Amino acid sequence: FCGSMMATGKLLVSYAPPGAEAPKSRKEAMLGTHVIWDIGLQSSCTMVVPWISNTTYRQTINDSFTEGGYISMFYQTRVVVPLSTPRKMDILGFVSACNDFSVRLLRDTTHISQEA
Amino acid sequence: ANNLPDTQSSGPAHSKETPALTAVETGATNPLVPSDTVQTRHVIQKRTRSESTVESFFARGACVAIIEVDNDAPTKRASKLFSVWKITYKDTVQLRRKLEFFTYSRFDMEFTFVVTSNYTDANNGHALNQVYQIMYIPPGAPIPGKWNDYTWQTSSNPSVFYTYGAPPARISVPYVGIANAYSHFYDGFAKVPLAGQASTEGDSLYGAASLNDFGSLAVRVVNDHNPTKLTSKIRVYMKPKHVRVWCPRPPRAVPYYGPGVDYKDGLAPLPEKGLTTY
Amino acid sequence: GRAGYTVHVQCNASKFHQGALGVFAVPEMCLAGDSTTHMFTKYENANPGEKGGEFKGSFTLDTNATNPARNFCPVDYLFGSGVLAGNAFVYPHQIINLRTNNCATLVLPYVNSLSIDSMTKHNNWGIAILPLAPLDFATESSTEIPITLTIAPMCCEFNGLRNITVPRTQ
Ligand SMILES: O=C(O)c1ccc(NS(=O)(=O)c2ccc(N3C(=O)c4ccccc4C3=O)cc2)cc1
Ligand SMILES: CCCCCCCCCCCCC/C=C/[C@H](O)[C@H](N)CO
């Protein structure tokens, strides 16, 4: 959370394992895995997306058989600021792998290409 | 009924411990003693809380009902030769309020019956000493329909025959609840209405559990009628015994209105008093 | 059905706001009705669901005899049951004082006169939230802040399986 120190709020960060309609409101999202983040002195919050999969591995392509689920963020209460404070702020997102993470079947990427 | 802690001598304080300051937001009460904020002497405390135990608080017979019966010719349709009183502590207020300091309770109950009688007129002779029958009718037992029908045989119901002029009758019952405690408050219904049921089905009074939870007392004058009409009142006094209570509640502040928590009148209990007036 | 609860009331504001909420967990929280008929609140209104209900500032008697509302009329200073609200602190409670905290957490055991009871017929607990000190903020426009309840059943235990109960609504 990169707002002012005088800004307060509670957010909800949710992970819904796949197979149902994607959460489009907090009511559905709070039924899945979720963390309620209180914006305070500690300005960062981490939600672990646990490994929940039918297959022992997922493919690194878009494929419904090994789909991973849905990640969403909602306002739990709301952002509240006093006067003389910016009413719009930014949050930044980061992602990393946990210590249980692994990959296999080396392959060439689609992220780099060359032309004659 | 335990004794109270002695007050310990406490001298001047100059330190970073601040018992005076607290945070009621936590929901806890600051357990301060006088020595925390003023200098105190040593006092050997001799006062005790023997009379504020729940047992001592309820160890009193309270009048819960006044059952009026008559001894008169059965042809006199105005006279009432027997009376049925459904058992409850909610016909009066005092014992009710004391009990409703708490949400749940277990207790044995002592019933004491004080019977008084009088002539109604003076031009029809006199009367011989009356005997009164007080029959407990547990829920489901047949309720008397007449002062002299078969039900008064009381083969299985407990009955007390009280002779007028004798000391008030008295009996005891154990804790008879079908639950593990009496519920002074029930936030629910006897029925859950079901979708599709007509509006006349599944409807029950809010907060009532059973239509007849503890049965009734049926009271009559056993004697055949004298030529003159006699009126009697049986005052019922309840005393809880071996009381246990759970989940204290704020006491009733406005007049009771029915057997529920409803209120209609007297909604302005507090009087007027200046903020800066001692 | 049987369950305890973890109730978490969430209400954040700024250091320039002020106000206090009393959050009370009331066993057997019976509320007063709105009519001359005793104990007349209907099941549908007594069980509003997640939306809950609101305390009122004064008692209004429902005089519509043809189509009675049969609803609660819980007055705030009577704590909705004819007892002074100031004494509601005898109940398990916390205070959200906006200058101090922005949340309250009440852990409620199963409280009842029975080991287990019918959850559809009987509400074991009530949650009451009363503004002990009014919300205020240095602006002419009326400020508003949200309160969010997050409740977790705990040690849920169910008995007597059969076809599903479908309570009447509306
Ligand atoms: O003299 C006193 O001790 C006595 C005198 C007054 C009193 N309070 S009262 O408000 O006047 C009152 C007066 C009568 C009844 N009452 C009835 O009228 C009745 C009829 C049938 C069964 C039970 C009852 C019963 O409680 C209840 C309360 C209680 C007891
Ligand atoms: C002459 C013998 C008569 C014996 C009568 C035995 C009945 C005992 C009744 C005790 C009264 C308990 C108080 C009431 C408890 C709560 O109100 C109920 N749980 C809810 O209605």
User: What DSSP string describes C92-155?
Assistant: SEEEEETTT-SEEEEEE---SSSSS--TTTB--EEEEEEEEEEEEESSSS------EEEEEEEE
Backbone angles phi, psi at B17, to 5 degrees: -75, 130
**Burial (Cβ within 10 Å: 0-12, 13-18, ≥19) of residue A38:** middle
- Asked if C101 and C19 count as a contact pair (C-beta separation under 8 A), the reply is no
Spatial separation of the C-alpha atoms in residues B82 and B148, rounded to whole Å: 9
Q: How far is B197 from chain C (nearest CA, A)?
A: 8
Tokens (6 digits) for C124:
């074991």
Spatial separation of the C-alpha atoms in residues B141 and B193, rounded to whole Å: 28
- Asked if C32 and B255 count as a contact pair (C-beta separation under 8 A), the reply is no
Cα end-to-end distance, chain A, whole Å: 46
- Asked if C156 and C41 count as a contact pair (C-beta separation under 8 A), the reply is no
Spatial separation of the C-alpha atoms in residues A51 and A46, rounded to whole Å: 15
- Asked if C165 and B202 count as a contact pair (C-beta separation under 8 A), the reply is no
The partner residues of C148 in beta bridges, in order of sequence, read C10
Query: B27–C94: do the CB atoms touch at under 8 Å?
Result: yes
Pairing type for strands B216-221 and B82-86 reads antiparallel
- Asked if B202 and C132 count as a contact pair (C-beta separation under 8 A), the reply is no
Closest by CA position to C83, among listed B260, B93, B253, B261: B253
Q: Which of A10, A14, A25, A81 to mutate to test the interface with C (most CBs of C within 10 A)?
A: A10
Neighbours of A74 (CB within 10 A): 18
Closest residue, chain B, to C92 (C-alpha) = B27
Comparing CB atoms, the residue among C10, C11, C16 nearest residue A82 is C16
Ligand nearest to the CA of B239: 2
Report the 3 state secondary structure along chain B: CCECCCECCECCCCCCCCCCCCCHHHCCCCCCCHHHCCCECCECCCCECHHHCHHHHHCCCEEEEEEEEEECCCCCCCCCCEEEEECCCCCCCHHHHHHHCEEEEEEEEEEEEEEEEEECCCCCCCCCCCEEEEEEECCCCCCCCCCCCHHHHCCCCCEEEEECCCCCEEEEECCCCCCCCEECCCCECCCCCECCCCCCCCCCCCCCCCCCCCCEEEEEECCCCCCCCEEEEEEEEEEEEEEEEEEECCCCCCCCCCCCCCCCCCCCCCCCCCCCCC
Which amino acid is it at B109?
M
Closest by CA position to C42, among listed B203, A64, B127: B203
- Asked if B89 and B99 count as a contact pair (C-beta separation under 8 A), the reply is yes
Strands (E) across chain A are located at 9-16, 33-39, 70-75
Spatial separation of the C-alpha atoms in residues A58 and C79, rounded to whole Å: 56
Ligand 2 atom at minimum distance from B208 CA: 21
Q: Which of B22, B96, B180, B189 to mutate to test the interface with C (most CBs of C within 10 A)?
A: B189
Query: B269–C41: do the CB atoms touch at under 8 Å?
Result: no
Closest by CA position to B112, among listed B172, B163, B175: B172
The partner residues of B104 in beta bridges, in order of sequence, read B183, B246
Which residues fall within 8 angstroms of residue A94, CB to CB, at 6 or more apart? none
* Residues of chain B neighbouring C32 (CB-CB closer than 8 A): 260-263
Query: A10–C17: do the CB atoms touch at under 8 Å?
Result: no
Computed on alpha carbons and rounded to an integer, the radius of gyration of chain C in Å comes to 18
Neighbours of A71 (CB within 10 A): 17
- Solving technique: cryo-EM
Query: C79–B185: do the CB atoms touch at under 8 Å?
Result: no
Tokens (6 digits) for B274:
């200046």
The partner residues of B109 in beta bridges, in order of sequence, read B173, B240
**Burial (Cβ within 10 Å: 0-12, 13-18, ≥19) of residue A87:** exposed
Backbone angles phi, psi at A65, to 5 degrees: -65, -35
- Dihedral sign of CA atoms C138, C142, C143, C148 in order: positive
Backbone angles phi, psi at B50, to 5 degrees: -65, -30
Long-range contacts of B251-255 (CB under 8 A, 24+ apart): B251/B97, B251/B100, B251/B101, B251/C83, B251/C87, B252/B96, B252/B97, B252/B100, B252/C82, B252/C83, B253/C78, B253/C82, B253/C83, B253/C84, B253/C87, B254/C78, B254/C82, B255/B93
Query: B249–C91: do the CB atoms touch at under 8 Å?
Result: yes
Strand order in the sheet with B131-137: B82-86, B216-221, B131-137, B159-163
Query: C12–A81: do the CB atoms touch at under 8 Å?
Result: no
CA C119 to chain centre: 16
Ligand 2 atom at minimum distance from B214 CA: 7
Site of tokens 């608080």: B57
Residues 154-183 of B with CB under 8 A from C: 177, 179-183
Comparing CB atoms, the residue among B187, B205, B263 nearest residue C122 is B187
* Residues of chain A neighbouring C148 (CB-CB closer than 8 A): 10, 76-77
Spatial separation of the C-alpha atoms in residues B85 and B81, rounded to whole Å: 14
Spatial separation of the C-alpha atoms in residues C17 and C6, rounded to whole Å: 27
Neighbours of B228 (CB within 10 A): 17
Task: Check CB contact of C102 with chain A, cutoff 8 Å.
Answer: yes
3-state DSSP call for residue A77? Answer: coil
**Burial (Cβ within 10 Å: 0-12, 13-18, ≥19) of residue B185:** buried
Which amino acid is it at B197?
Q
Q: Residue C28 region, left (φ>0) first, then alpha (ψ -120 to 50), else beta?
A: left
Subunits with 3+ Cβ pairs within 8 Å of C are A, B
Whole-angstrom CA distances from B128 to A3, A101, B117 are 94, 100, 12
Resolution, given in Å to one decimal, reads 1.9
Closest by CA position to B164, among listed B236, B233, B74, B237: B233
Residue ranges around ligand 2 (CB below 6 Å)? B 87, 89, 109, 111, 134, 136, 158, 160, 171, 173, 176-177, 182-184, 209, 213-214
Pairing type for strands A70-75 and A9-16 reads antiparallel
Tokens (6 digits) for A27:
């009511």
For ligand 1, atom 11, name the residue with the nearest CA: B92
Comparing CB atoms, the residue among C11, C14, C147 nearest residue A82 is C14
Site of tokens 């309160």: C147
CA geometry: angle B163, B165, B171, nearest 5 deg? 55
Whole-number Å distance, alpha carbon B65 to ligand 1 midpoint, is 6
Which amino acid is it at B199?
S
Tokens (6 digits) for C66:
């043809």
Task: Check CB contact of A27 with chain C, cutoff 8 Å.
Answer: no
Whole-number Å distance, alpha carbon C62 to ligand 1 midpoint, is 29
Neighbours of B20 (CB within 10 A): 9
Closest by CA position to B246, among listed C127, C33, C109: C109
Mutate to test the pocket of ligand 2, among B64, B84, B87, B242 (most ligand atoms within 8 A of CB): B87
**Pocket flag, ligand 1, residue B114 (CB < 6 Å):** no
Closest by CA position to B251, among listed B108, B103, B138: B103
Q: How far is C69 from chain B (nearest CA, A)?
A: 14
- Asked if C92 and C29 count as a contact pair (C-beta separation under 8 A), the reply is no
Interface B:C, ≥3 CB–CB pairs < 8 Å:
yes
Q: Any idea what DSSP says for residue A29?
A: H
Closest by CA position to B190, among listed C118, C162, C111: C118
3-state DSSP call for residue A66? Answer: helix
Spatial separation of the C-alpha atoms in residues A51 and C135, rounded to whole Å: 44
**Pocket flag, ligand 1, residue B10 (CB < 6 Å):** no
Whole-angstrom CA distances from A46 to A23, A36, B48, B162 are 20, 10, 56, 78
Neighbours of C70 (CB within 10 A): 19
**Pocket flag, ligand 1, residue B69 (CB < 6 Å):** no
| Domain segments of chain B as ranges | 1-278
DSSP conformation letters of C39-56: T---HHHH--GGG----B
Buried b (16+ CB within 10 A) or exposed e, A54-67: eeeeeeeeeeeeee
Long-range contacts of B7-14 (CB under 8 A, 24+ apart): B7/B33, B7/B34, B7/B35, B7/B40, B7/B41, B7/B42, B7/B43, B7/B45, B8/B35, B8/B40, B8/B42, B9/B35, B9/B40, B9/B41, B9/B42, B10/B34, B10/B35, B10/B36, B10/B38, B10/B39, B10/B40, B11/B39, B12/B39
Q: Which of C18, C21, C30 to mutate to test the interface with B (most CBs of B within 10 A)?
A: C30
Buried b (16+ CB within 10 A) or exposed e, B142-170: eebeebeeebbebeebebbebebeeeebe
Whole-angstrom CA distances from B256 to A16, B59, B61, B100, C86 are 51, 23, 21, 11, 19
The partner residues of A26 in beta bridges, in order of sequence, read none
Which amino acid is it at A68?
G
Give the number of A-C residue pairs with CB atoms closer than 8 Å. Answer: 44
Task: Check CB contact of A71 with chain C, cutoff 8 Å.
Answer: no
**Burial (Cβ within 10 Å: 0-12, 13-18, ≥19) of residue B186:** buried
Ligand nearest to the CA of B217: 2
